[PDB]
């Protein structure tokens, strides 16, 4: 299942947990469009900080 979540709000925390669990055990691909984020491109020498 390629589930799309246009907006997280009002979601049960148990349901969000169950969805991530599906992402892992059923290989769900879940695209959360609500999120905004900045990115940093680490060099291999610095690793994930």
């Amino acid at each position: 299942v390629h589930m799309t979540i246009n907006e997280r709000a009002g979601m049960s925390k148990l349901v969000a947990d169950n969805i991530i669990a599906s992402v892992i055990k059923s290989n769900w691909v879940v695209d959360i469009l609500d999120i905004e984020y900045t990115a940093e491109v680490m060099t291999p020498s610095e690793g994930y900080t």
């Binding site: 709000a9 009002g10 979601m11 049960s12 925390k13 148990l14």
Partner: protein, 49 residues
């Protein structure tokens, strides 16, 4: 003939079949929920019924 209702007539009957639960109905597993509030108060759609 079918049996006359006990409440139909003026006799007193000192034995009757009382329906009853086998055990206490207050198990103690009271229902509990997860209320989860609107994210933005401005964003709420009061409209449409």
């Amino acid at each position: 003939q079918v049996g006359i209702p006990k409440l139909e007539v003026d006799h007193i009957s000192f034995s009757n079949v009382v329906s009853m639960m086998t055990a206490n109905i207050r198990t103690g597993d009271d229902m509990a929920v997860e209320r989860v509030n609107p994210d933005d108060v401005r964003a709420i759609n009061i409209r449409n019924a």
